[PDB]
Structure 1
């Protein structure tokens, strides 16, 4: 399984598919944002969507 990191102020998503890393922005509205720069994020490659630290 893949995995990326999430930023607190730069709420961004960075994951690597295979042997290369990518960069994507997280559309945080209310709680879709991040609170910890070290926190991890999730990105749907099949859904072509980016997700960050959200309440569940």
Structure 2
């Protein structure tokens, strides 16, 4: 896919996702409906849209 999944940190508002055999930590958005609101929630980096979302559906 273009989507690379991981889990978010509520304290840090980060997403740690897996891509190319490595883990990568990116800030989540600060937007209300994309930030990490629930610790360890699934999150995704989408390298098609060039976006992060820490409230994936």
Q: Say whether the fold is shared (TM-score over 0.5).
A: yes
Bigger radius of gyration, 1 or 2? 1
Extract structure 1 runs of 4+ deviating beyond 3 A. Answer: none
RMSD over equivalenced CA pairs, Å: 2.0
Compute the TM-score of the two structures, normalised by the length of structure 2: 0.70
Structure 1, unpaired ranges of 5+: none
Structure 2, unpaired ranges of 5+: none
Question: Which is strand-richer, 1 or 2?
Answer: 2
Say how many residue pairs are matched: 55
Compute the TM-score of the two structures, normalised by the length of structure 1: 0.71
